[PDB]
């Protein structure tokens, strides 16, 4: 029931020979795994933690100047010198001013002038980095037991969370009553934390590209620097003003916090106050359902009366969830649940909370099932007092096919070349598709890095037009496909 | 904004007695954050029902909850002497706060 | 400044909403529209120059769009 | 951001030096150079697109320049 | 002389008294008393709702977030009528004086 | 959630590129611009003649 | 839709397209009307007063 | 006005009479007829324009009918 009520649900159906399935886990998403003899499980990536961050650069977003000094030299005497030019905590500039008898000079020319001021940082943004071995993905595996944890906390069940680290990427959950599940994850491929910086700025943290971070035009410290006083690009945070040729001056350029916020658009925000927590990204895992068994398959039908205690509702995914209570004898019984037609001649829908059972009489169990599009009837119980529930599913099968194609394409857009692993059961077609996607995505990312979505749409339109106005059919079709894919990615790029 | 409940209620032992918790479209008419608390004298409130009808693990099955429109109801079927207590209704409102009923005193006699 | 290099085409993007993604999506186009409205004179010259340079109508439109998009931003 | 709408072409310039004339004279060209260095792939594809669209070297070179100048800008 | 203020821009603000209101799917928009006040910046959006968070339906529930906007620094812009425009000129003859 | 989106002093300083600075601290003084004048030499007589 | 002791069964989208000032379904104050301008007119006949 | 967007053509009709079906069935026809009577000048211009945009009596009659129906409606 944890995975219900989340609009980004994914249904992964089927395990291969070996009883394993490849599932990508995303933070905002959730995965419901359906296997034939296995119970239905819900997998959610609820946390990614980076530990032991190391700073590589401390940028200055707000500074001040305190000790301004000037040296002036008469024309043809060369540029002047201040003793504080050697000082790395001072920012200096060389200019020229008009000189002559009026200035106490005696030569009437452009006399070089140098002005220096002490650069002091008042606000900085850290750029901590983390080693890929220090990530820790937390995952919650919850099965469709149809039951609840129960408020009585003296016993706490149904809450198995597994931590996955690059060192320990294989772990098993012990779901009570359902055996155990094995997750064979690959954290080292989910995110390249050697090309990412945990940018923290005034109680707000972002995850950013490392080259982008190193390219920022603000003054920076090495990161091990413990006293400031050696800022590198101090000239980017100051301005030297020589109106006409009378005097030279230097002033600071105000807090760069808002300009940084503008620069950070397109960077995913993370948390860095109580640990470095990243609620973004994906995990590729292999699900080992071999030692996963349905609970209570030795039980018998209830042969009793059920009452609906939570009225049937339709989730955002085309399934229906209902909560029924059993009022009969033989408490540990399988619940007779069918999605038939009006005459009950055909089975039209397949339930999702597979093998719904009653463990205690006074313990409601909520069933999730997938009805067909249109009229359908939910039948619960057996002939005496059997409760028959009607339902109408408003969609269309063609509409569902379109929605699933759209969802698959969107997954490809986000997890490019990793979308081939979301539900893959091995196979040769999946491998060929993934290899082709890797080869094509290498070129696409090379040719489209650092381009805004508007530029992507423009380039897609241009390429589509070029392909349309192409004599060669072999070139025209390829160009049109490239243009349409570019247009799609540009229309669904910013996230 | 306090949820409205009858000041008092009495029912003969072994009978069934119902309590009402009338609220607005935000507190008890808009959301299923309806909970019933039983408080014996000199003791902290005890969660009797939640999600309208669901009852805690230790809570007897004699306690049943219903909700209709802006009104949520609590029913007791056994009416044992131990059931005589003060019952409070609460709801999590649309603005993110918690509102409590005025509380009904149930007496068996 | 830093605001002129706004961490857009860096990959690293996911399902989770990015920072300032509601506004930055269209604020550039809004800015270009405001510039074109506030400076009609240049847009006419850009159209005339694109017409002169562009042999076909595809080249002319492409050149005009590029010119009018780069005129304010190049500032 | 306000930083994307500077006060450059307002036509009020006098002989007196402006706010960041020395600094901001070449900042945009520096940004274009850095972006082109960090993202060569878009440069090659922009050159290919300009060569295809442009029937004459003038059109091709102009299109390539405009594409390269506008790509970092929206970025 | 005597410039007149034409507009005050805010360059540094702060948000306080943040509040949110939610409604179940298909039941319309949530309401916040602070929406009436213009010192509060507010936005409407949709969140996932369902049994888990107290709704009987499983759609996109509307939500409104309101916070109080307070300005901390200003960028006042003033105007001057050309009449109050004292210019100062210095005329020095080539008298040849020593200084 | 709602966040206040930083301080725009530096962003404005960058936006003011191409604008000449003036002194409004006390008096709203301007040290930029021109002034066209017509000079009358009628009453000018050489000193020391 | 019910209006002054008469009720109608209307289309939902049509009802939400109505050009009148409205309040949300759950609004306690009753005073934050949304599109008030549909029920008031502003007069500036001669550009003298409004 | 709300009166300018009636609850007509919404697909919710049943056997039971709607709110003002009998009265409002021919209101539009009555209004167009009254407008045509009061404003015979525009009808002649509409006929002339329909004939000018002709090549077929079906086209001319359809265009004239549409213009006459839209003249009061546009108000
Ligand atoms: C800078 O000026 C301060 C006065 O505010 C003075 O105390 C300090 O010694 C100076 N430091 C230098 C000149 O390095
Ligand atoms: C300028 O004039 C002042 C006063 O007339 C005199 O003291 C000074 O020596 C002159 N020369 C300068 C300031 O170079
Ligand atoms: C906002 O909260 C402060 C407490 O931090 C309080 O003093 C003030 O009255 C509140 N304002 C409003 C409009 O609720």
PDB file of C-alpha atoms and ligand atoms in Angstrom, chain A residues 66-67 84 87 89-90 118, ligand 1:
ATOM      1  CA  UNK A  66      39.376  48.127   3.591  1.00  0.00           C
ATOM      2  CA  UNK A  67      42.898  49.496   3.060  1.00  0.00           C
ATOM      3  CA  UNK A  84      51.201  45.689  -1.265  1.00  0.00           C
ATOM      4  CA  UNK A  87      50.483  40.890  -1.037  1.00  0.00           C
ATOM      5  CA  UNK A  89      45.243  39.585   0.211  1.00  0.00           C
ATOM      6  CA  UNK A  90      45.330  42.864  -1.754  1.00  0.00           C
ATOM      7  CA  UNK A 118      42.576  44.563   0.834  1.00  0.00           C
TER       8      UNK A 118
HETATM    9  C1  LIG I   1      44.455  48.489   7.503  1.00  0.00           C
HETATM   10  O1  LIG I   1      43.779  49.583   8.134  1.00  0.00           O
HETATM   11  C2  LIG I   1      43.480  49.354   9.519  1.00  0.00           C
HETATM   12  C3  LIG I   1      42.679  50.543   9.994  1.00  0.00           C
HETATM   13  O2  LIG I   1      41.283  50.304   9.875  1.00  0.00           O
HETATM   14  C4  LIG I   1      44.775  49.152  10.298  1.00  0.00           C
HETATM   15  O3  LIG I   1      44.472  48.873  11.660  1.00  0.00           O
HETATM   16  C5  LIG I   1      45.569  48.003   9.694  1.00  0.00           C
HETATM   17  O4  LIG I   1      46.827  47.882  10.347  1.00  0.00           O
HETATM   18  C6  LIG I   1      45.789  48.235   8.203  1.00  0.00           C
HETATM   19  N1  LIG I   1      46.481  47.103   7.608  1.00  0.00           N
HETATM   20  C7  LIG I   1      47.432  47.234   6.678  1.00  0.00           C
HETATM   21  C8  LIG I   1      47.759  48.637   6.266  1.00  0.00           C
HETATM   22  O5  LIG I   1      48.002  46.263   6.190  1.00  0.00           O
END
